[PDB]
């Protein structure tokens, strides 16, 4: 009954049937994106309408289409032909991954380049990388992928250990032409293998690790109803799944006594980008938007009990569409479990004699995705005390190159002859806020230092300053760790028992934002990543910080275009967009497979409750 | 046999006997500090000499003494009379906590102040707060505590809910005189109680939390030998305990193949300070150094299985001295256990077909201390991948005041009429480094942005810069989160297989440092807290960033005096001092008992190993 329920296989099968009968899904068509649309604002109408948005690619060169379907009514709502030179190309298709390698294998320029290096073409893997927009006029309106080559010595070999530097090719995957092959010179292919399961490299496995057993004898403390509605320790929320964004959290609310109090209407990681900092022409174009160009949800892993998720695990198995509109289940794609989280509160009082200890715990919702060499875990955490936290875990295999004789200012050495170019991993969290309802505002809070003098005779005082962001044009904000800068989302019409507006405070990690020159192509296409915080007025069609069609878009779409409307955000339905990321100078310890590194953010209540919300937690 | 073993009760009993027979421990003497001295550098002599340092207070007004004893030889090594107006007073004694309240209860000025407020003197608790150094010439060379009052309505009442604002007294605890009583006016005493175990305040306890069972069926993976020597997953270290510093880690090393490689010679939290930012004369003097003035180790809690420490716990029970030289055991004062820590590394490869997942875990060493209203957990973590992390957990009850009519720029409101002054919690970690041996250096590493232009035509390149700190005068450093600033401790004489110096990188949280005006008393006494990182040359007697005698010291002792020697630190035996802290604007959710908040730092290997050190972890 819930309009926020996960898409079913039957819904996707109906979408396929509707598209087919409307003439929109012939043999030359491919579904590049399919997802359920959220209910519109003010859906207190009980009139459920399950609508799906579809991007349709044409492999024969015809114009792609954007289509909205109503599965409830069995109709096509709208269908629009896209001009991709104007509005961007469609996301990369999984079936194009192999096309780049296959097309190059018959190109005489590519073959001549491999022959000079004595590389057997049957052993050469080609990574299908997104193209971006640079100086090549012939690429406008064409669907281009760029290929970098890696040698696999045998079928189980890790190709990443053997980059073929000095070589890149550009491919038009619709006309099936190799447009350019660039060979800047022969680099030795690094020879050491990177096979992290080879006993010769691992040595004998440790026998010292004794088991840790985590069980829940009475079962877990949370309940799941309607497929995807979670209630846990006064929290309630809906867990969604979208093929572009991955796990999406809807309707996050906290039961405070008799009242269900909303906090966040929708939370998602709405974009991520990995820009490379190597000026070599072989890689200086390299920036991949895993979310916007590749769709991270479709590469979600099936998570294994005991290995990926440990304890009393409840799984969700989301259903997505394949390229032909058939439903495909991601078995055990989302893990949900609670975890002990140490001490919650503790005090031993010298005057009352009372000794008091309580333990904390958190609810975990997570999935893992794999796109090429990189693997990412996305973790959402709910804590007993009202804190909400997000954590990204980056692992997998670093992207490699040759390490040049005489060194590099932009590449780390990992092994003899083997390099790893500097890069960043930058995320955008889209938080459709609903602090006690939809009338919200954002304030920027800085520590204020005070000078010794009258009224501060001992020079000890310090204070804080709060600045309300009133219009979109002033709501593009930068971090300032030195002044302890945070941002408070409050509801000016909902007050706590002290007559102060209720609120939540966003705590950032204050990592560097996008390092590229502001005049670069990537600074224009990933403008969201140049600032730590953006606030917009809610609008149905403003979904992604980079716009709807990221692949080969020339720039400026998304957040820079939205905020130019300069809308009122002071006590309105607003959306917070937070940029956060890792800057990665790879270390030897990252090779041949990288130990997890993490980044994230959290929100903590700030006068949202009338006192500690965990006074009713029992003594365990 | 280990010179780093914990002090035994027999050792402390021998110290008492040695002091007594030397005439140093008559009825008027009290031991204010007692601790074992670390072995001197170059102790490859097998000549064990267990020596103890003792601070001896005299309650009759005679000069205190610093005494060094050899328990191995049964002799007094040295005994020096202290001039406390010059070098500072001794730490606060536990038995002085009650003296402040008892002396005020018979002072007519104090009684007149309580009478005007209709407060029964038998219900008034007085917090014994350290005095600092301000404008009062009569306090120089005298042992002063300052008292702030709180009402306890009944013996189990939380007094912190009922501050008596507008009133402060200063007390000479040796001559037993009340030197000043300052009454700036009547504030209503806040009336709501803060009894977090009262069912009227908690409501009915939740019945929704199901148990989480963490067990180790084969026992833990670590071993403890010689009382306090830990070996765990290639790590080895000695766990010390000192009554001032608390848990101290010695000889942290990692077994890399056949080699035991040192990393850190000694790690401790060597000072902590809580400065208050309220300019009211009632509290503008308030800054307590829990470590240096009160000695956090002597107030360590006994930790309860299942509540404080959960899982398969191994306890240490350190022995300390009471004020008369009797040994006193802190039963179950230190918890040690390993914890699952999620995914360690993961990759699913599109070309090799191999799916790989490993789980992480960490070793935890922790203790909890309580000093008045505040409670702190100190956590040291060792991870499989070579990371070392420290985490402080702050909880307990916030220090309170009245909330003034018409508001405050320096105090938060928690309840009707109840305020909580702004403050910071600042820690100093002292890391006696030993990266592959004692020849170390520190480099400061900043991200470098590059301009679009020749050699960077697409404007994507970025790099990094490393600056070696060569002398103490240039080794006082500030954080810069915007440039991703970190610090690398390396050994220039020990190289990895790529011929690069081995190293470890310190990652700070980049929280604000001391906010007080640089001309303030607290900026002079806690100068360490004004900068994020200091590096000194190792010296036996340079133990604390604030000096040996913090209580009522006029300023400048410790780190500012050490670095004026301007010693060579480039490839030498060096010590890193890292300042980190929390800035606390109290929220309603912190009342009546505060949920834990955390701060810390971590060190990660940076080309210390020749490849990932966790390739030999089994598949679980
Ligand atoms: O993560 C997206 C870029 C990519 C895709 C496929 C293989 C290697 C790299
Ligand atoms: O934490 C040291 C300051 C203090 C000591 C005793 C009671 C309250 C406060
Ligand atoms: Cu990376
Ligand atoms: Cu605090
Ligand atoms: Na365009
Ligand atoms: Na909103
Ligand atoms: Na002095
Ligand atoms: Na050292």
In order, the DSSP letters of A530-546 are GSSEEEEE--TT---TT
Q: Is B544 annotated as a binding residue?
A: no
A423: CA distance to ligand 3 center in Å? Answer: 6
What's the distance, CA B15 to chain centroid? 27
**B chain contacts of residue A617, beta-carbon cutoff 8 Å:** 205-206, 209
Tell me how crowded residue B63 is: count the other CB atoms within 10 A of its CB.
12
**B chain contacts of residue A338, beta-carbon cutoff 8 Å:** 212
Please, what's the b/e burial string for B400-410 (b: 16 or more CB within 10 A of its CB; e: otherwise)? bbbbeeeebbb
Element (H, E) at A81: strand A75-81
Interatomic CA distance for residues A231 and A233, integer angstroms:
7
Ligand number with the minimum distance to the CA of B590: 4
E-assigned strand segments in A296-433:
314-316, 319-321, 327-329, 334-348, 355-371, 374-383, 388-396, 401-402, 411-415, 418-421, 423-433
Q: What is the DSSP letter of A293?
A: I
Residue of A nearest to B287 (CA): A460
Tallying the residues shown for chain B, one arrives at 620
Q: Torsion-angle region of residue A583: left (phi > 0), alpha (psi -120 to 50) or beta? A: beta
Nearest to B586 by CA among A254, A456, A611: A611
- A258: buried, middle or exposed (CB in 10 Å: 19+, 13-18, 0-12)? exposed
Q: Are B495 and A522 in contact (CB under 8 A)?
A: no
Interatomic CA distance for residues B232 and A212, integer angstroms:
15
Query: Which residues, in sequence order, are CB contacts of A387 under 8 Å at separation 6+?
Result: A381, A602, A603, A604, A605
Paired residues of A168 in beta bridges? A182
A329: CA distance to ligand 3 center in Å? Answer: 30
Please provide the DSSP assignment of A200-221 as one string: HHH-SPP------EEE-TT--S
**Which position has the token pair 């991703």?**
B484
Nearest to A479 by CA among B268, B488, B500, B483: B483
Nearest to A340 by CA among A507, A217, A216, A247: A216
Provide the pairing of β-strand A418-421 with A411-415. antiparallel
The answer to whether the bond into A592 is cis (omega within 30° of 0) is yes
**Do the Cβ atoms of B481 and A484 come within 8 Å?**
no
Q: Known catalytic residue: B374?
A: yes
Ligand number with the minimum distance to the CA of A263: 6
Q: Which two tokens stand for residue B42?
A: 């170059």
* DSSP-based three-state secondary structure for A349: coil
In total, the C-beta contacts within 8 angstroms joining chain A to chain B are 433
Distance in Å, alpha carbon of B97 to nearest chain A alpha carbon: 10
Nearest to A600 by CA among A531, A489, A527, A510: A510
Which parts of B422-520 fold into alpha helices (H)? none
Paired residues of B288 in beta bridges? B274
Q: Are A14 and A71 in contact (CB under 8 A)?
A: yes
Q: For testing the chain A interface, which of B158, B299, B342, B518 should be mutated: the one with the most A CBs within 10 Å?
A: B342
Interatomic CA distance for residues B54 and B76, integer angstroms:
11
> Which CA distances in Å does B241 have to B32, B295, B303, B576, B577?
16, 12, 15, 20, 19
Please provide the DSSP assignment of A426-437 as one string: EEEEEEEE-TTS
User: What domains, with CATH codes, occur in chain B?
Assistant: 1-87 (3.10.450.40), 94-195 (3.10.450.40), 196-619 (2.70.98.20)
Please provide the DSSP assignment of B271-294 as one string: EEEEEB---STTTTT-EE-IIIII
CA angle A55, A58, A62 (to 5 degrees): 115
Interatomic CA distance for residues A254 and A491, integer angstroms:
15
* DSSP-based three-state secondary structure for B467: strand
Q: Which two tokens stand for residue A560?
A: 């820079």
Q: Give the residue, out of A132, A149, A295, A371, with the most ligand 1 atoms within 8 A of its beta carbon, to mutate for a pocket test.
A: A371
**B chain contacts of residue A349, beta-carbon cutoff 8 Å:** 158, 397
- B441: buried, middle or exposed (CB in 10 Å: 19+, 13-18, 0-12)? buried
Q: Which two tokens stand for residue A389?
A: 């936290």
**Using CA of residue B83, residue B85, residue B91, residue B97, what is the dihedral sign?**
positive
**Do the Cβ atoms of A218 and B201 come within 8 Å?**
no
Q: For testing the chain A interface, which of B351, B363, B503, B620 should be mutated: the one with the most A CBs within 10 Å?
A: B351
**Do the Cβ atoms of B521 and A449 come within 8 Å?**
no
Tell me how crowded residue B518 is: count the other CB atoms within 10 A of its CB.
13
Provide the pairing of β-strand B29-36 with B51-58. antiparallel
The answer to whether the bond into B216 is cis (omega within 30° of 0) is no
**Do the Cβ atoms of A351 and B279 come within 8 Å?**
no
**Do the Cβ atoms of A156 and B353 come within 8 Å?**
yes
Phi then psi dihedrals of residue A442, to 5 deg: -115, 135
Q: Are A516 and A279 in contact (CB under 8 A)?
A: no
Q: Are B585 and B422 in contact (CB under 8 A)?
A: yes
Nearest to B579 by CA among B445, B426, B458: B426
> Which CA distances in Å does A615 have to A385, A388, B156?
10, 19, 17
Please provide the DSSP assignment of B411-439 as one string: EEEEETTEEEE-EEEEEEEEEEE-TTSS-
Interatomic CA distance for residues A588 and B605, integer angstroms:
9
Interatomic CA distance for residues B435 and B448, integer angstroms:
26
Q: End-to-end alpha-carbon separation of chain A, Å?
A: 37
Query: Which residues, in sequence order, are CB contacts of A356 under 8 Å at separation 6+?
Result: A345, A346, A347, A348, A349, B196, B197, B593
Interatomic CA distance for residues A247 and A365, integer angstroms:
8
Q: Are B525 and B546 in contact (CB under 8 A)?
A: yes
* Longest Cα separation, chain A: 87
Q: Are B578 and B506 in contact (CB under 8 A)?
A: yes
Interatomic CA distance for residues A261 and A460, integer angstroms:
39
3-state helix, strand, coil in chain B (%, to 5): 15, 40, 45
Q: Give the residue, out of A95, A372, A395, A423, with the most ligand 1 atoms within 8 A of its beta carbon, to mutate for a pocket test.
A: A372
Q: Are A443 and A449 in contact (CB under 8 A)?
A: no
Query: Which residues, in sequence order, are CB contacts of B169 under 8 Å at separation 6+?
Result: B100, B104, B107, B109, B110, B126, B146, B147, B178, B180, B181, B182
Q: Are A246 and A269 in contact (CB under 8 A)?
A: yes
E-assigned strand segments in A470-591:
476-477, 486-495, 501-508, 533-537, 574-584
Tallying the residues shown for chain A, one arrives at 620
**Which position has the token pair 């009922």?**
B162
Q: In what order do the strands lie in the sheet with A334-348?
A: A314-316, A334-348, A355-371, A374-383, A388-396, A594-605, A501-508, A486-495, A441-449, A462-469
**Using CA of residue A197, residue A199, residue A202, residue A207, what is the dihedral sign?**
positive
Q: Torsion-angle region of residue A230: left (phi > 0), alpha (psi -120 to 50) or beta? A: beta
Q: Are B579 and B533 in contact (CB under 8 A)?
A: yes
Q: Are A262 and A253 in contact (CB under 8 A)?
A: yes
What is the Rg, in whole angstroms, of the alpha carbon atoms belonging to chain A? 26
Interatomic CA distance for residues B446 and B449, integer angstroms:
10
Tell me how crowded residue A46 is: count the other CB atoms within 10 A of its CB.
7
B159 lines ligand 2 (CB under 6 A): no
Up-side HSE of residue A255: CA atoms within 13 Å toward CB? 11
Q: What is the DSSP letter of A305?
A: B
Q: In what order do the strands lie in the sheet with B65-70?
A: B29-36, B51-58, B65-70, B75-81
Q: Are B327 and B319 in contact (CB under 8 A)?
A: yes
- B259: buried, middle or exposed (CB in 10 Å: 19+, 13-18, 0-12)? exposed
Up-side HSE of residue B351: CA atoms within 13 Å toward CB? 26
Interatomic CA distance for residues A399 and A594, integer angstroms:
11
Q: In what order do the strands lie in the sheet with A418-421?
A: A401-402, A418-421, A411-415
Q: Are B475 and B487 in contact (CB under 8 A)?
A: no
Paired residues of B402 in beta bridges? B418
Interatomic CA distance for residues A327 and A223, integer angstroms:
27
Q: Torsion-angle region of residue B99: left (phi > 0), alpha (psi -120 to 50) or beta? A: alpha
Q: What is the DSSP letter of B608?
A: -
Q: What is the DSSP letter of A294?
A: I
Atom of ligand 2 nearest to the CA of B293: 2
Q: Are B434 and B440 in contact (CB under 8 A)?
A: yes
E-assigned strand segments in B423-562:
423-433, 441-449, 462-469, 476-477, 486-495, 501-508, 533-537
Query: Which residues, in sequence order, are CB contacts of A153 under 8 Å at separation 6+?
Result: A123, A162, A193
**B chain contacts of residue A373, beta-carbon cutoff 8 Å:** 347
**Do the Cβ atoms of A393 and B351 come within 8 Å?**
no
Atom of ligand 2 nearest to the CA of B371: 1
CA angle B596, B597, B600 (to 5 degrees): 130
Nearest to B87 by CA among B68, B63, B69: B63
Query: Which residues, in sequence order, are CB contacts of A138 under 8 Å at separation 6+?
Result: A179
A546: CA distance to ligand 5 center in Å? Answer: 13
Query: Which residues, in sequence order, are CB contacts of A514 under 8 Å at separation 6+?
Result: A275, A424, A426, A522, A523, A526, A529, A530
**Which position has the token pair 């997570």?**
A366
B273: CA distance to ligand 2 center in Å? Answer: 12
Element (H, E) at B521: helix B521-525
Phi then psi dihedrals of residue B104, to 5 deg: -70, -30
Element (H, E) at A42: none
CA angle B463, B467, B471 (to 5 degrees): 175
Q: Are B439 and B491 in contact (CB under 8 A)?
A: yes
- A516: buried, middle or exposed (CB in 10 Å: 19+, 13-18, 0-12)? buried
Q: Are A165 and A401 in contact (CB under 8 A)?
A: yes
Interatomic CA distance for residues A606 and A442, integer angstroms:
13
What is the Rg, in whole angstroms, of the alpha carbon atoms belonging to chain B? 26
**Which position has the token pair 């000078």?**
A451
Query: Which residues, in sequence order, are CB contacts of A458 under 8 Å at separation 6+?
Result: A452, B134, B279, B284, B285, B520, B521
Count helices and strands in chain B by DSSP H and E runs: 7, 34
Phi then psi dihedrals of residue B164, to 5 deg: -105, 95
Instruction: Please report the resolution in angstroms.
Output: 1.7
Residue of B nearest to A464 (CA): B409
**Which position has the token pair 């208050």?**
B276
């Amino acid at each position: 009954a819930s309009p926020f329920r996960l898409a079913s296989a039957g819904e996707i099968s109906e979408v396929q049937g509707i598209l087919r009968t409307a003439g929109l899904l012939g043999p030359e068509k491919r579904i590049a994106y399919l997802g359920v649309l959220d209910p519109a604002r003010g859906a207190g109408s009980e009139a459920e309408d399950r609508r799906f948005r579809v991007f349709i690619h044409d492999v024969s060169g015809a114009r792609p289409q954007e289509v909205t379907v109503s599965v409830t009514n069995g109709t096509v709502i709208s269908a629009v032909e896209l001009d991709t030179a104007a509005t961007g190309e469609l996301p990369v298709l999984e079936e194009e991954f192999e096309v780049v390698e296959q097309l190059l294998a018959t190109d005489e320029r590519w073959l001549k380049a491999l022959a000079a290096r004595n590389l057997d073409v049957s052993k050469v893997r080609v990574a299908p990388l997104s193209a971006g927009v640079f100086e090549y006029a012939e690429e406008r309106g064409r669907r281009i992928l760029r290929g970098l080559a890696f040698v696999q010595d045998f079928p189980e070999d890790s190709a990443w250990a053997h980059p073929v530097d000095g070589l890149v090719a550009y491919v038009d995957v619709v006309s099936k032409e190799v447009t350019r092959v660039i060979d800047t010179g022969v680099f030795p292919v690094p020879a050491e293998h990177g096979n992290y399961t080879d006993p010769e490299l691992t040595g004998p496995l440790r026998t010292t690790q004794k088991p840790i057993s985590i069980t829940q004898p009475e079962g877990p403390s949370f309940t799941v109803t309607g497929g995807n509605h979670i209630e846990w320790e006064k929290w309630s929320l809906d867990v969604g799944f979208d093929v572009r964004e991955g796990v999406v959290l809807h309707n996050i609310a906290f039961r405070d006594g008799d009242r269900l109090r909303p906090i966040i209407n929708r939370a998602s990681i709405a974009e991520m980008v990995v820009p490379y900092g190597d000026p070599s022409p072989i890689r200086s174009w390299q920036n991949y938007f895993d979310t916007g160009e590749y769709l991270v949800g479709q590469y979600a892993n099936s998570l294994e009990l005991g290995c990926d998720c440990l304890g009393d695990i409840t799984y969700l198995s989301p259903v997505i569409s394949d390229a032909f509109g058939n439903p495909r289940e991601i078995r055990n794609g989302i893990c949900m479990h609670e975890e002990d989280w140490g001490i919650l509160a503790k005090h031993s009082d010298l005057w009352s004699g009372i000794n008091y200890t309580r333990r904390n715990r958190r609810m975990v919702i997570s999935f893992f995705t794999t796109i090429g060499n990189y693997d990412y875990g996305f973790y959402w955490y709910l804590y007993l005390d009202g804190t909400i936290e997000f954590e990204a875990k980056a692992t997998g295999v670093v992207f490699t190159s040759a390490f040049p004789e005489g060194g590099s200012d932009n590449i780390s050495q990992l092994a003899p002859g083997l390099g790893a170019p500097f890069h960043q991993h930058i995320f955008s969290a889209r938080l459709d806020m609903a602090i006690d309802g939809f009338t919200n505002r954002v304030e920027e809070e800085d520590v204020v230092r005070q000078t010794m003098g009258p009224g501060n005779e001992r020079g000890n005082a310090f204070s804080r300053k709060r600045t309300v962001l009133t219009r979109e044009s002033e709501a593009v904000r930068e971090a300032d760790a030195r002044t302890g800068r945070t941002w408070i989302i409050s509801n000016p019409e909902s007050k706590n028992r002290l007559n102060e507006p209720v609120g939540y405070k966003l705590h950032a990690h204050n990592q560097p934002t996008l390092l590229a020159d502001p005049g670069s192509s990537i600074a224009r296409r990933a403008a969201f990543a140049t600032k730590d915080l953006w606030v917009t007025r809610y609008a149905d069609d403003e979904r992604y910080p980079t716009g709807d069609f990221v692949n080969q878009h020339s720039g400026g779409a998304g957040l820079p275009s939205y905020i130019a409307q300069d809308r009122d955000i002071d006590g309105q339905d607003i959306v917070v967009w937070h940029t956060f990321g890792l800057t990665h100078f790879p270390r030897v310890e990252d090779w041949p497979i990288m130990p997890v590194d993490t980044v994230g953010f959290k929100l903590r209540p700030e006068g949202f409750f009338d006192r500690s919300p965990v006074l009713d937690v029992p003594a365990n």
